[PDB]
Design a protein around this ligand. Structure first.
Ligand SMILES: Nc1ncnc2c1ncn2[C@@H]1O[C@H](COP(=O)(O)CP(=O)(O)O[P@](=O)(S)OC[C@H]2O[C@@H](n3cnc4c(N)ncnc43)[C@H](O)[C@@H]2O)[C@@H](O)[C@H]1O
Ligand SMILES: Nc1ncnc2c1ncn2[C@@H]1O[C@H](COP(=O)(O)CP(=O)(O)O[P@](=O)(S)OC[C@H]2O[C@@H](n3cnc4c(N)ncnc43)[C@H](O)[C@@H]2O)[C@@H](O)[C@H]1O
Lengths: 124, 124
């Protein structure tokens, strides 16, 4: 019941949801704990975001990171937004990639829902 | 009169300044128009930012990008924050890297002040 470009994201893999943004797990994380934060409204370019959704997108992005860094035992975070077709954007929806980091660094929907469930505990 | 870790940034190379953040040019941009946006207060990890400075850091980051994308003729933006020593952070100050993007992609302080001056026109 979450739009992410032209796909619908089953709540099962969504682990946080604010008034304006939401965060979810990946089918192929680049690193354990690689997750995403996207505004609820489907805009394709970061510049299309009202300034309230931008505050919200990154206050949420701040929070989500503190948790996966904890949860997945990282010591540093890597944040990044691929904003446009020439920046590598594949899904035309704004979305921050949050990747926990460590010194020297595909799955089933159920493994995704398991992971989202664990992440939901930290936002309780 | 701008702190960026343990260095002082001469206003000459600063091209925007809000109540909470500020943006500046690079001595070695990775791509023409690669610039930075940093909170005025020197925190070393994104999580150390109040939520007001986070709204401000990214509302500002939204603006700055729209301009360098225009100015440097890009068609897409790449945003990214290296948050921690294991994420590649070199300067222990929070700072978003904004890089304009195009299909298939060191200088003197004066060349830096020239560039900041041009960027200041778009925020007039
Ligand atoms: N050395 C290094 N190597 C790699 N990354 C590094 C690095 N250093 C720093 N970084 C860091 O690693 C990041 C590089 O990641 P990236 O920007 O290359 C991933 P993307 O696939 O291009 O993303 P988008 O198209 S925008 O967004 C689409 C995303 O949503 C997901 N998605 C789409 N549909 C989905 C669905 N239905 N269900 C679940 N997920 C879906 C996709 O899997 C995809 O990840 C940077 O932040 C950098 O600082
Ligand atoms: N294929 C690709 N290749 C490269 N980047 C890509 C990519 N695809 C996407 N990206 C994109 O390119 C970016 C990768 O850039 P990066 O994160 O590797 C640069 P950094 O030097 O590690 O940054 P920091 O330590 S955090 O911050 C320090 C910064 O402040 C500057 N600085 C420090 N002191 C200064 C001073 N006194 N005066 C002026 N500037 C100063 C430094 O030059 C430095 O750039 C990503 O956003 C990605 O999405």
């Amino acid at each position: 019941s979450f739009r992410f470009g032209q796909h619908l994201i089953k709540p099962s893999v969504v682990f946080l949801k604010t008034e304006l943004s939401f965060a979810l797990v990946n089918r192929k994380p680049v690193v354990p704990g690689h997750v995403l934060v996207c505004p609820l409204r489907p805009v394709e370019r970061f510049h299309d975001l009202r300034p309230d959704e931008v505050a919200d997108l990154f206050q949420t992005t701040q929070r989500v990171g503190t948790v996966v860094e904890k949860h997945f035992h990282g010591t540093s975070l890597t944040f990044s937004m691929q904003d446009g077709p020439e920046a590598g954007q594949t899904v035309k929806h704004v979305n921050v990639h949050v990747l926990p980091r460590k010194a020297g660094d595909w799955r089933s929907e159920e493994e995704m829902a398991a992971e989202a469930a664990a992440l939901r505990v930290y936002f309780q």
